[PDB]
Amino acid sequence: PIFLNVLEAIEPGVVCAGHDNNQPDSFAALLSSLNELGERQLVHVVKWAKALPGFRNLHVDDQMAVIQYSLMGLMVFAMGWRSFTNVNSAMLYFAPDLVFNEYRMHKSRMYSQCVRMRHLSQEFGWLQITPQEFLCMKALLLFSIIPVDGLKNQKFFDELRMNYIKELDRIIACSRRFYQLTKLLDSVQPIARELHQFTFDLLIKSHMVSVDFPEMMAEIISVQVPKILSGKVKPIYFH
Amino acid sequence: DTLFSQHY
Ligand SMILES: C[C@](O)(CS(=O)(=O)c1ccc(F)cc1)C(=O)Nc1ccc(C#N)c(C(F)(F)F)c1
Numbered sequence: 001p002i003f004l005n006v007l008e009a010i011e012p013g014v015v016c017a018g019h020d021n022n023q024p025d026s027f028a029a030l031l032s033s034l035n036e037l038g039e040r041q042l043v044h045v046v047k048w049a050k051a052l053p054g055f056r057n058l059h060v061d062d063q064m065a066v067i068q069y070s071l072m073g074l075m076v077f078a079m080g081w082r083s084f085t086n087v088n089s090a091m092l093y094f095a096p097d098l099v100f101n102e103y104r105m106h107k108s109r110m111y112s113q114c115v116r117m118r119h120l121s122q123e124f125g126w127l128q129i130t131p132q133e134f135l136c137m138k139a140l141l142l143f144s145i146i147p148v149d150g151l152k153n154q155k156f157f158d159e160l161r162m163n164y165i166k167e168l169d170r171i172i173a174c175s176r177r178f179y180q181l182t183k184l185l186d187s188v189q190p191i192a193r194e195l196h197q198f199t200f201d202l203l204i205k206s207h208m209v210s211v212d213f214p215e216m217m218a219e220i221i222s223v224q225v226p227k228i229l230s231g232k233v234k235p236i237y238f239h
Numbered sequence: 240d241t242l243f244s245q246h247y
Contacts, residue, residue, distance in 0.1 A: 046247060064247050216242045223241070
């Protein structure tokens with residue numbers, strides 16, 4: 001199985017947040033670590049994406065755009081899978097050193113979104129999703145959000161997306177399975193959008209609440225994320 | 240230009 005060989009080969013390993021677990025769970029502390037973790041995971045997502053079958057076919061600018069637009073959804077989906085496999089969706093396993101219990105969920109002021117992410121993590125159990133299904137679905141999430149006006153080379157993107165859908169169907173090769181996985185994929189987007197809204201608001205008030213953003217995450221939040229919140233860049237839903 | 244494009 002060549003395509004699956006490649007996904008398994010390129011899958012990022014463990015990323016720590018650098019969180020100081022001896023300090024008390026404050027909002028500013030938890031946040032500052034999530035932001036640092038997000039940059040660390042983006043560095044890995046970029047190396048991953050660059051190594052995916054056909055990805056280098058995209059215009060370079062379209063490569064960078066799609067990674068930035070899809071980063072949140074990728075991180076949520078992979079986090080839900082880590083949660084499932086590590087702690088049976090009991091808690092949110094952002095990183096080995098940043099595991100959220102309920103108190104954290106509350107302290108982070110992200111409780112409603114945390115609850116949605118835990119529900120997603122449970123879906124992985126409720127659907128019996130396989131490691132191979134996980135890997136194809138995650139590869140497809142990179143190709144699931146685009147400018148309503150299209151990419152620089154939209155034809156190349158559509159052809160890649162089409163082939164990743166086909167790989168997901170070949171890894172299912174029942175039509176019930178496909179309905180359910182496409183539905184699970186769609187459920188990522190509303191969570192990512194709420195996180196993007198929370199993230200943008202947090203960055204605007206970050207000086208007031210003492211939350212630290214690495215420079216590159218600041219730029220992404222101020223340049224890319226408002227395209228999504230303004231409706232210029234939108235998810236491709238199946239349903 | 241952009242910090243991301245320079246990372247990329
Ligand atoms: C609050 C924030 O730190 C913002 S951020 O990571 O800087 C970010 C900034 C810009 C984006 F386009 C996407 C994400 C965040 O969402 N962190 C974060 C870090 C790790 C993981 C994981 N795993 C997640 C989540 F997706 F799982 F929620 C979220």
